[PDB]
Structure 1
Amino acid sequence: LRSTPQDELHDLLCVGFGPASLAIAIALHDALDPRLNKSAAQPKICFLERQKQFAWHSGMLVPGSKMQISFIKDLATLRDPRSSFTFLNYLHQKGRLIHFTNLSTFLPARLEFEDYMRWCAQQFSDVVAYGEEVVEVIPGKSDPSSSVVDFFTVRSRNVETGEISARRTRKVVIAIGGTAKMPSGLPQDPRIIHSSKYCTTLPALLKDKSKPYNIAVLGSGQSAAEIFHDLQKRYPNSRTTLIMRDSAMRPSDDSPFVNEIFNPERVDKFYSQSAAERQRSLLADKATNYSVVRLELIEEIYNDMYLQRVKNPDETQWQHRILPERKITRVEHHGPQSRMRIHLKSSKPEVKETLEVDALMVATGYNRNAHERLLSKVQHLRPTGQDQWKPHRDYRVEMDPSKVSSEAGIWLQGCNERTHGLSDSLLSVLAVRGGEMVQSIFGEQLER
């Protein structure tokens, strides 16, 4: 794709260049390829990224981490396996395809799947601005005296300098993913770090890999266990503690009949379900994604735990402990020492031990309400009284017909789980979704 001057009115502007946005670029590429598309000027497009270059959750690129989805659900295959942008094609291009096969694995390393996506991302370098974090989407009318909005202005603070530029577009896509979630009862402290910053910020706080540190992990999801399992290797002399409110780490559900809610086609049937059944579906199918660990990592962790029992039959004296059904009441981070003091209570409804730590990893997951801050200026374009954005099946936010021109729009991606299903936040349907997105955004063009 060719670059568009900043000054010009774009056909489409995307906020975020993670997997979801990247899949749109790919599908737009493919739709325009006469090789893959017998039908096939070029659309004027731009992607804006807070990061200085493409990375995929670098703060959680723990050594040994695997991806949790089949390599077949890559960025292109499910829409079209002929596509240039498939995992297998990427592998072939690196000279690794015969070698990957010999693993007989469906689950590449996280590190490798990032490079596949980085290899995709580099081919849209003409149309992606990096280090540009979007601070607001603002309505605009080509006819200032008229009462009709037909474009949107999107402004971003430069990460390096701080300068704010603007780029005008008819259509907007917010694919920003998630923001780190932090329990409200936790104080602000450099010792207190969220899982998303584990690889990037913990090495600078605990600079000595040799030192007898005390480290704690709050959580029982996938992040929790990866960190907890990594701490034993990365800090061999540390005493690690895993605090969780549940009784146990629970296996993630990938069973073939359950796993079909992740089918691209099921999105239509899911969307069509009532709110009662959607709330019901997500709550029953919870263990496909949330607060669950991969079985193999549970078994790996348990087996380490058992090894300690062979060495010492007294559990309180182990190096690496698990404390189930505990909440945190007080944190003391003003004591003169290098170690802050964590107070614990039974997570059961109606005073346990007190821990001293050099760091606290909080692996409490992610929220997905980040678009609100960007769209508050655009809130007055909804139907009267509507205090929440309503996404349609094509992902366009319902707006007011008399206030917004049909050419103008805003789509959301990765936040629509409550309307589209458990696959929305994930990699599952990105190939097909991207293709569908190219259909709603550019479909006027692509028909002629």
Structure 2
Amino acid sequence: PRLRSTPQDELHDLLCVGFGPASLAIAIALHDALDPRLNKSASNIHAQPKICFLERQKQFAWHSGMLVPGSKMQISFIKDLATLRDPRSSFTFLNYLHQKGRLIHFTNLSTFLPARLEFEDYMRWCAQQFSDVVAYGEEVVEVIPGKSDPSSSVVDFFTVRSRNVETGEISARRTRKVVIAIGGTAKMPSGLPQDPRIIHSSKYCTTLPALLKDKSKPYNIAVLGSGQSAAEIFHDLQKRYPNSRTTLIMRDSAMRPSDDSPFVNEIFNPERVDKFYSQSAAERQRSLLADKATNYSVVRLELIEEIYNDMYLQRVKNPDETQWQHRILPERKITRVEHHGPQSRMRIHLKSSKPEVKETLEVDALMVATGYNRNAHERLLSKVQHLRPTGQDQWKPHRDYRVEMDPSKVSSEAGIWLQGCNERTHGLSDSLLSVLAVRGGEMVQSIFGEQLERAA
């Protein structure tokens, strides 16, 4: 079963916004549902669904700005894009390794946690097989309701408009159903001024070398935050700029270890989504807070220990902490950034993070590892907001990820699904790779179920 491209002017069955892991999992699940080898009823399928994926990136990439050398996956390779739904799938990580002549070699490592670089290539290899149905260099700018009968009051399709990233021309594609799977945006502290020397972690590998071109120069470089991203950048900087002075600034008193214990981590199981979803708003908010240390503002223990050991090595060489080349400043917040000075160094003013004073740093660059927001789907959906039930000022995704729309305004064949931004309703596993294989399988059934039943 090879998915063929649909002409731009034809009515699509599905239009996915984004082609990151979440969308890729849906594409794979669709391939597998139409594979007569994997699914018996697939022989009876006559027509290929008309499908298209829109991705703003020029080609498949997985958080390329954070592909720090030596950087490792944080989940078992078994939770790849296909295995948890079907180990027989040709899209498993193990089958990818086999296709590359690397299976025996990966096995000899005895590791569940491949390099981020390797796992990106696996997903890239997966993504390449859907090149006929993916349009790269397309940034979706809006989703617009359409009525096949304009004189009526019922919406039965959607228009998706995207801007070509190279040339800036706007194209439209019409579809019965939309999936929005666009991940998250860089989250910056509101207090920080805009400056080329102030860069979010997500652009670390991509944009910092352009700013600090000489690797041997004695720069002063600061890192803000204490999550995984901060730890990785802080650690890497010591290798990438050997003569640099680095400072880690955090409002917490310490880097804290991620919770990887097996009982707690069962919250990430695919079957647990039903259980999480069915809870009340108060119980869900309570559960997410209670299990926060699995995912947010936490560092893998092994990395913490490495950094800590480097700190002690500095202590051996020099007992005076103020003289260390690489330093951690706990329980601090940035009150002022001076960035209009003649010199190439900004002046960062610090105070105690403690509730109701401190030093100053001269830095060539500030890396801001302050996490992400997942609200970008809102802007894409503003023109379809009036289709929601009257008075409801927020999108409400059902268990199957389809947003609630007023039944009398929107036809049953038309719909919009959200992926990767539903943590509040679906649990901590929603933004991760943990349930993507199973969720992909669910999504295909939700969207293409009518066609798949006919063949079944």
CA distance in 1, matches of 2:30, 2:208: 39
Shift of 1:350: 1.6
Shift of 1:222: 0.4
Which residue number in structure 1 is paired with residue 297 of structure 2?
291
CA distance in 2, matches of 1:411, 1:245: 37
SS in 2 for 1:424: helix
Q: Normalization by structure 1: what TM-score?
A: 1.00
SS in 1 for 2:406: coil
Shift of 1:114: 0.1
Which residue number in structure 2 is paired with residue 372 of structure 1?
378
Task: Give per-residue Cα distances to partners, 1:338-395, cap 9 Å, x unaligned.
Answer: 0010000000012100000000000000000000000000000000001000000000
CA distance in 2, matches of 1:297, 1:351: 31
Task: Give per-residue Cα distances to partners, 1:164-202, cap 9 Å, x unaligned.
Answer: 000000000000000000000000000000000000000
Shift of 1:219: 0.5
Shift of 1:271: 0.2
SS in 1 for 2:5: coil
Shift of 1:245: 0.3
Task: Give per-residue Cα distances to partners, 1:225-259, cap 9 Å, x unaligned.
Answer: 00000000000000000000000000001100000
SS in 1 for 2:430: coil
SS in 1 for 2:162: strand
CA distance in 2, matches of 1:94, 1:351: 58
Shift of 1:264: 0.1
Task: Give per-residue Cα distances to partners, 1:119-138, cap 9 Å, x unaligned.
Answer: 00000000000000000000
Identity, % of aligned pairs? 100
SS in 2 for 1:47: strand
CA distance in 2, matches of 1:197, 1:350: 34
CA distance in 2, matches of 1:274, 1:62: 40
CA distance in 2, matches of 1:293, 1:91: 29
4+ residue stretches of structure 1 with deviation over 3 A?
none
SS in 1 for 2:349: strand
SS in 1 for 2:41: coil
The question of 1:382 aligning with 2:384 is answered no
Shift of 1:263: 0.3
Shift of 1:218: 0.2
Shift of 1:276: 1.2
CA distance in 2, matches of 1:305, 1:267: 41
Q: Normalization by structure 2: what TM-score?
A: 0.98
Q: Which runs of 5+ in 1 are unaligned?
A: none
SS in 1 for 2:28: helix
Q: Which runs of 5+ in 2 are unaligned?
A: none
SS in 2 for 1:435: helix
CA distance in 1, matches of 2:338, 2:439: 47
The question of 1:168 aligning with 2:170 is answered no
CA distance in 1, matches of 2:135, 2:390: 36
Figure out how many residues of one structure are paired with residues of the other and give that number.
448
Which residue number in structure 2 is paired with residue 362 of structure 1?
368
The question of 1:237 aligning with 2:243 is answered yes
CA distance in 2, matches of 1:132, 1:26: 21
Shift of 1:79: 0.2
Shift of 1:417: 0.2
SS in 1 for 2:282: helix
Task: Give per-residue Cα distances to partners, 1:69-126, cap 9 Å, x unaligned.
Answer: 0000000000000000000000001011000001100000000000000000000000
The question of 1:225 aligning with 2:231 is answered yes
CA distance in 1, matches of 2:38, 2:389: 40
Which of 55, 58, 62 is the matching residue for 2:61? 55
SS in 2 for 1:267: helix
SS in 1 for 2:448: helix
RMSD: 0.3
CA distance in 2, matches of 1:299, 1:441: 46
CA distance in 2, matches of 1:103, 1:282: 34
The question of 1:21 aligning with 2:42 is answered no
Which residue number in structure 2 is paired with residue 80 of structure 1?
86
SS in 1 for 2:171: strand
